[PDB]
Amino acid sequence: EAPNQALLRILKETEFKKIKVLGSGAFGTVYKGLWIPEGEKVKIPVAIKELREATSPKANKEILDEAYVMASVDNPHVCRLLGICLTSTVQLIMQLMPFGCLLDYVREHKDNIGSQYLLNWCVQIAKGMNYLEDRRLVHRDLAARNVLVKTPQHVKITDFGLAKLLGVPIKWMALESILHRIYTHQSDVWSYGVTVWELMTFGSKPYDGIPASEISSILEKGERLPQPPICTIDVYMIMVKCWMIDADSRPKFRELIIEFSKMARDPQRYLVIQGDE
Ligand SMILES: */C=C/C(=O)N1CCC[C@@H](n2nc(-c3ccc(OCc4nccn4C)c(Cl)c3)c3c(N)ncnc32)C1
Ligand SMILES: [Cl-]
Ligand SMILES: [Cl-]
User: Is residue 182 located within the same domain as residue 262?
Assistant: First the structure.
């Protein structure tokens, strides 16, 4: 309820440039580039995401609401918007993270990642998600690919709210989302569980070898992702709770922060990793 004095920067096309493509995703294409604020004598390296065309009817109405949220973010574990340009296309400008997404990071560094880092990442993601819940925003696409590494000890969530805006990731979705297209903070919790599984397996693909078309059927039969080799039952049990059919029986993000935080105080008790003494 304090005044929100975030800045919404509406950028002229001349105030930034795209220099090199970094990759593409469900929502658009990401480039490294420069932000060159008019009359300020500086140039700042940034990431720029050019959004794909919306399949949604009202998205042009909603783009600004989405910008407001991204601009407004004030949590260490959620990424923020630097500026937005709306012309022929919508382009989002934000800080450039040299260390990239968490999914690639765990795959690339698997031999070197220990229990403290893994648990801390769980806490941090939970913290960011809790913040988004406080703001009444449902992410709809939480996944390891949508977490960026600021430093190996500091990760931040991206891309919240774009799925709705733009109008699927079946393997990360709660059953109610798949069957009924219902999305809630509790559906986010299910995705959080899948995301944790991705981390704990050093970036394995969930349900690898099962076609997306079969996922709703297997879930209904009680199948769930398996216990990762490094995980004690204490960690895995939390992940399984995230995947309860009854959304209200799943943990709250605030509870998740607490549970992971406790385990992060003695990480070797809760994850068993070679060379992690
Ligand atoms: C595993 C992730 C992956 O493969 N990629 C492809 C290469 C580029 C990577 N990447 N993406 C961004 C980025 C994410 C989200 C962005 O805007 C949406 C948003 N979420 C919160 C706030 N905002 C504005 C933007 Cl503009 C870029 C990257 C960034 N920002 N830095 C480094 N790599 C990024 C993902
Ligand atoms: Cl920060
Ligand atoms: Cl950020």
Answer: yes
Q: Any catalytic annotation for residue 141?
A: yes
Q: Choose the final residue of a domain: 96, 111, 144.
A: 96
List C-alpha distances in Å: 60 to 41, 88, 121, 157, 208.
Answer: 33, 12, 34, 24, 36
DSSP state of 28: E
- The residues lining ligand 1, judged by C-beta closer than 6 Å to any ligand atom, are 22-23, 25, 30, 47-49, 70, 79-81, 92, 94, 96-97, 100-101, 103-104, 145, 148, 158-159
State this model's resolution in angstroms.
1.8
Side by side, the strands of the sheet bearing 83-86 are 16-24, 28-35, 44-51, 90-95, 83-86
Cα distances from 228 to residues 10, 50, 199, 204, 237, in angstroms, run 45, 36, 10, 10, 11
Q: Residue 117: which residues within 8 A CB-CB, separation 6 or more? A: 152, 153
